[PDB]
Design a protein around this nucleic acid. Sequence first.
RNA 1: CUUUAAUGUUUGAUGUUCUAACGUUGACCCGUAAUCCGGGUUGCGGACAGUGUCUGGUGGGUAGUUUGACUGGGGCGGUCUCCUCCUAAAGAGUAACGGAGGAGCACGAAGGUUGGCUAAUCCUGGUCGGACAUCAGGAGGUUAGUGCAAUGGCAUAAGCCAGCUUGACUGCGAGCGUGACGGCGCGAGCAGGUGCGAAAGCAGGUCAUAGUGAUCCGGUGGUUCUGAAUGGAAGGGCCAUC
RNA 2: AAUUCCUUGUCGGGUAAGUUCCGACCUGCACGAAUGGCGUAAUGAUGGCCAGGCUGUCUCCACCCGAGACUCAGUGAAAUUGAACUCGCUGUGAAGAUGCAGUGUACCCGCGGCAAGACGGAAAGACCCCGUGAACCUUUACUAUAGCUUGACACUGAACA
RNA 3: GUUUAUUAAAAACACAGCACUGUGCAAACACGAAAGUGGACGUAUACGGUGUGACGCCUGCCCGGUGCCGGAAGGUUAAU
RNA 4: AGGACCGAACCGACUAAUGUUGAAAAAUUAGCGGAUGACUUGUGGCUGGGGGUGAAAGGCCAAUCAAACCGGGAGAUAGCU
RNA 5: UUUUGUAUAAUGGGUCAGCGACUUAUAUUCUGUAGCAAGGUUAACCGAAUAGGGGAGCCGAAGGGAAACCGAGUCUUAACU
RNA 6: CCAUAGGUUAAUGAGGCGAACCGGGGGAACUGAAACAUCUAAGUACCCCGAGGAAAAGAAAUCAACCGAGAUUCCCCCAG
Lengths: 64, 51, 96, 76
Amino acid sequence: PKIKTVRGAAKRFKKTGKGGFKHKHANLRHILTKKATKRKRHLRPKAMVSKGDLGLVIACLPYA
Amino acid sequence: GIREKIKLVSSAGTGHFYTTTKNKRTKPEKLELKKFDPVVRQHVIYKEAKI
Amino acid sequence: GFEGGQMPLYRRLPKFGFTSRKAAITAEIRLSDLAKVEGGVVDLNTLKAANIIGIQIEFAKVILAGEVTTPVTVRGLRVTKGARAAIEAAGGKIEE
Amino acid sequence: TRNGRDSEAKRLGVKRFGGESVLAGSIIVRQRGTKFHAGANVGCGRDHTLFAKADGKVKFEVKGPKNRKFISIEAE
RNA sequence: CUUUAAUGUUUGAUGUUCUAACGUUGACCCGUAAUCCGGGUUGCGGACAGUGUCUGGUGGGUAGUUUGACUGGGGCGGUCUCCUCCUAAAGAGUAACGGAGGAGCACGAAGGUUGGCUAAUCCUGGUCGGACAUCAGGAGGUUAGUGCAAUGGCAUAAGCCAGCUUGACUGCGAGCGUGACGGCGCGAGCAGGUGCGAAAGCAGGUCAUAGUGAUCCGGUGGUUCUGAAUGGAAGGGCCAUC
RNA sequence: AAUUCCUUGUCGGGUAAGUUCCGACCUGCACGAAUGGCGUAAUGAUGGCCAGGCUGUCUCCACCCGAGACUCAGUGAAAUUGAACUCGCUGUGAAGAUGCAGUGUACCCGCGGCAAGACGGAAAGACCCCGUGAACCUUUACUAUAGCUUGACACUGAACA
RNA sequence: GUUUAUUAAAAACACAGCACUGUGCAAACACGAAAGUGGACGUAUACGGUGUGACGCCUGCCCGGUGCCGGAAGGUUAAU
RNA sequence: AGGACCGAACCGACUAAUGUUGAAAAAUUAGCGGAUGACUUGUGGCUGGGGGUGAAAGGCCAAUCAAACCGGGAGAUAGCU
RNA sequence: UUUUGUAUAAUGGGUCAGCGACUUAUAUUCUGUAGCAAGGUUAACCGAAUAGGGGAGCCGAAGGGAAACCGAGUCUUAACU
RNA sequence: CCAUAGGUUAAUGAGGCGAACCGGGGGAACUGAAACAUCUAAGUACCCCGAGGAAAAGAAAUCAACCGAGAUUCCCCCAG
């Protein structure tokens, strides 16, 4: 049959122009008062996925 | 430890806050600071409140 | 995405965003795809006739990709500056 | 209590050596205190990390009363 | 208003009676040749008992499961994240149930800036005053101090004391370092708007290195986003935060 | 002591000599009163100890009678088996050698016997550990649940305080 | 007397007797979604459960813990 | 008279030797316990698998029992060989 | 065969003959190869039935943003050197 | 007492067997989740009842979106 997308992955990655994947950064949901502004500011923009974890995300998102 | 969290809230009625800690036993009296409100884009008084 | 039972990457990271229902019923038209209509007037119903957009589509936009030769009267669609300029310089007409 | 414990290695030390050409921003030495101090075109960070403020070749030297090791720079 | 009364009033629940539901494994009559069943007559119970739906308590009576790893075999003991020194072979990194110690916080000042200042210890004299307390002088040279381990720093003090204050700002960030990745760290400089200083300037917390916890779920505030026929709203997103 | 670790406790008895037995002592590691205490005639294919009788149990075996063994005739299995031209010693070596090195010994093949070796045969160790294996058992482990109990609404009505 | 048919016959199980406890009869209890059946064509000198185990002499102290029994004033508490 | 005594049949199974690819998937020889009883035996019947039955050993339920046998789910699953 | 390592006295095989283990379907990615090329290709079904019809669809020629929205740009920010 | 239950005869009908397919009533666990209880396996296996050459479903108190479509059934897309 058809391949089924891993639906977790779908809600956390999104495909770009040259085929990479953007993702929200971890560490910004709570326990914030202590984190320094700088730390929190640098986490806010979305990030691309590293070269050694694209295999793990192309598997989960084969219709992406 | 005995070192609780608090909002400082802007006195311009944007609900912008900073959050910080305070020892409640050793200092009871309420914390009042000038800080930058980024919505109006000025420095302003900020007062204590509950987190 | 099993990493031997380390927390796997699609679960370390946050979920983000929501799916807009309005985007499923939007299109983009290229300029290259305005020769291909049969009329030289460009409604939504004229584009569906020529199999350039789908049956479910309520909105479109004409964007600047490709050239255009003739005068072509656009109607009820949106258009980007980069385009509007290139429709009108070719002799054409936009009327909302 | 017995033993069993140590921390993770903090990968301090000199990174760029004298001669080596750098770009402004480049860290030159991580360090706990000021084994080295900042001379010309060099910032003491807040953890006393020393970094280029200009492009050029790194120069070490000694200076002053106490014979302290300064990292400075020759902007090319 | 307080307190209290009979006027009327809606439900309550606590008795005591009753009989008509319901019970009868009381007696007799019939179907019938039958200790079943049913029907009748007559007693005794009687809205109780008992059965349904909902609900609290109990429930190894029964069922499904769980009950960690390292480990000079396992068990018992000990450990499991983080910081400092040594082991570590003069860059980095580097193991052992190798050798030593710490942390799971504190501080609206113990942060910022301008100005000023320089320690421990011992000796001599001096009311109560003694080995030890405030005073004076001399020697001494950081043997001191640095909120807390250790190490590296520190007089231009990063140590100590005063004045004024909130840069313990918001948006960003060339470029470096460090990680398998998640991530963690340093950062000149640009814009907005502050503080100190006459000014050059300095300030995006603390001499540095511990003081911590991914995602999911949910909560609180805000919002030019969304809103399943349309207008709202609910919910969802984004920002702040628990 | 069906209970006492120290323990062959100490003392007495029994034996030439008694870690057992019998009687005591009490220092009961850690007896004890219906998960019964202390006693008890009779009973016991029940445990321990002693004595008489009897004995090849033994000193220490000998001889004899039968059944197999052995030979001949007839019938005719089995476990096992990588291949074999299948010696000893010392050394070596995945660490206990018929098979390697060095050396010694040995004409070729049977039959009766013995069992030291072939880490002989019979069995994918039962002991130990591991598996995010299984089962069954326990409980004040977790979550349920049959059952037993509580109340509310229903079947369920009347009158009078 | 009984017992591990096929490595255990015993000091194990049973036993007469003792004690506690439940049960008023449509009994407790047991088997059955229920009807029903056993208990028993018995009725407390009877029946079920538990422990001890002829007989003789006996059977001491503790109700804090855990069960069971009783008590209802007050607290806490479900559906409704 | 007697869950009395001795002891054949009958029921059992304490000791030894043999047997251990047996004569036999539990026997044989020599001795051994009960033997009018809580005895023994024939024929037929009832109880069914988390169920039965058990003077209780986790014993027995067709040479199988801390959960029978036959078929099915089923090519269960096997980070192991 | 398994191993750091086997003549091993670790595993397995008495011998011979026969049978005995990387398959199939449907998706998806990359390479090779053929066709056509800013286009490529049809599915069910129809049908003189491996033709021809059928372009419903699918992939591509545009991306950014959570989204509205904008678009060779866009997001971030009051604003970007 | 009248009735009613009951009883006797007559006429007509059913019962059982059988591959799969179909509709309904009951309904697992192994397994996956690298443990496990929500969840999965699966409304599958199996048990039971009923019907026919087919069965079931079926002519909107249906969708749609301010334009419109016009009962059920089956195939390809929509779409992992």
